[PDB]
Design a protein around this ligand. Structure first.
Ligand SMILES: N#CCC(=O)NC1CCCCC1
Ligand SMILES: [Cl-]
Ligand code: NA
Lengths: 302, 306
């Protein structure tokens, strides 16, 4: 029993974190086989913040301009190339700790673990979710760029996020491991603002199902709703639209608990209307939206 | 910016996790040097659990009755002995991945990272606090016994918890790595209940400081208070008493933010008596008490471990 915000064990990713230095800038790199991946803005100077021409800045660099340090060991850079907003540094040594891995670009609402690192060394691991506005609500200090987000399927590491910058509202933006930013953001210091964020409705419903599995039913009701009436109500609370795709995803959790998906939708509508009235659900006085249906089944069933 | 419930990087402990099987029971063991540590109730059948005599149950077992698997490699048990509620299995091979480590016993209100394991394979990591009633609000399924809790202090892993059982209320109980239970619990299938819990006051204050660092300031007010006055309110609301040592520990946060500790206690006094009034603090409608002052300093400064 119990339900916690659970991250993946970080050891497989820890063995891949290195430090990348270019000029006076130092951030984190991801060392997989004989390639080190890091944000391309490591090559920017103080005058290259607003409108850097990365092709022009990169063509001026030599392999020895990049200092890559793995633990107490300097790796020799033997080549470099740009792919979108990430830099790929070819090194003369394959990482002997390289796990089974792949790169996956995730969709809003998906969750992943973040290994926050500074100077190539991990600081902590926590759980995140891609917000509907393509930001993440992380915990990052200066020097955390190049930290990665990931999931682990059995023993294969799925890298899905690399940290690039913090927006003025204190939220964070980054790329997949192919260098493509999540959302409309760019690696420039020009004024950028995240769109108004919304609640991940399918995740809230999955987390209500988790509460029932763990033995709590106080929030259910005798009502149901149509899918459209639910959405008409939920939008007024800044909730994401619930699609038929989302209803299908919740099928297994519905079958396990015996509560139809649209019945849970009616329970959610009432919670938004009433609040919790001094009660809690799985230890929280707010509705939690950073547990996916996949997260719930993995944590509640193994 | 940002503040998250953050666990220590679990890599050093992942390399110590093994599978231990005794008869039909399989759980997790901790492999350090040439000894595997696991709960002593691994030797018990279902009827043994009702009223076990662990010394007598252990005599019948031979070294080959303990099947230890490190990954896909079997470990040869060459000796077995008991220390309190943990079993110690001497193996023929020292763990080459043994980190610099100590066995430590933590205090209520202290936090630690849990590496949840099944069949010797780590599956999750999350942060817990040792509650004042000596339970932890964990997330454990069947097969998770032997999962361990730990902190990291400059390359040295401090092992502080090993999971043993779940209480009827869904919270969890375990021992230190020397077999001593946290709380008034025993490893036997019998009527056991967690005592009435209280809120860790020093941790709530630390988390309010984390909120101020991150720009959440609406709960600040003009008032201050005294230790005696605040503890009267804390007792009324089932909050642990605030000691002078707690005030000293919060000292660094009191200067990084510019908010005195007693100044913050007056904010907490008002929040307890009036509530949050529809507002939130660091994205929470409840007062979070599982961040220690050292946790808040560590996350808001960037301290790393190898
Ligand atoms: N089961 C299952 C699949 C699942 O959890 N789907 C997620 C994908 C990301 C958005 C939120 C829903
Ligand atoms: Cl996805
Ligand atoms: Na005050």
């Amino acid at each position: 029993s119990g339900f916690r915000k659970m991250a993946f064990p970080s050891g497989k990713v820890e063995g891949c974190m290195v430090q990348v230095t270019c000029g006076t800038t130092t951030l984190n790199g991801l060392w997989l086989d004989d390639v080190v991946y890091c944000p391309r803005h490591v090559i920017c100077t103080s005058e290259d913040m607003l409108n850097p021409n990365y092709e022009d800045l990169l063509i001026r660099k030599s392999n020895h301009n990049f200092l890559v340090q793995a633990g107490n060991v300097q790796l020799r850079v033997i080549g470099h190339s740009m792919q979108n907003c990430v830099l790929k540094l070819k090194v003369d040594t394959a990482n002997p700790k390289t796990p089974k891995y792949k790169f996956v670009r995730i969709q809003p609402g998906q969750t992943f673990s973040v290994l926050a690192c500074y100077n190539g060394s991990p600081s902590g691991v926590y759980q995140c979710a891609m917000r509907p506005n393509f930001t993440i609500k992380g915990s990052f200090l200066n020097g955390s760029c190049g930290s990665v987000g990931f999931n682990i399927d059995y023993d294969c590491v799925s890298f899905c996020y690399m940290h690039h910058m913090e927006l003025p509202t204190g939220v964070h933006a980054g790329t997949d491991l192919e260098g493509n930013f999540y959302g409309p953001f760019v690696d420039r210091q020009t004024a950028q603002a995240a769109g108004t964020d919304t609640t991940i409705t399918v995740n809230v419903l999955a987390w209500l199902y988790a509460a029932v599995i763990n033995g709590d039913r106080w929030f259910l009701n005798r009502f149901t709703t149509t899918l459209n009436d639910f959405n008409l109500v939920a939008m007024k609370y800044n909730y994401e639209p619930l699609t038929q795709d989302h209803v299908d995803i919740l099928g297994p959790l519905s079958a396990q608990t015996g509560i139809a998906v649209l019945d849970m939708c009616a329970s959610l509508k009432e919670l938004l209307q009433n609040g919790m009235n001094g009660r809690t659900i799985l230890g929280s006085a707010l509705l939690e939206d950073e547990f996916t249906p996949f997260d719930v089944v993995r944590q509640c069933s193994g």
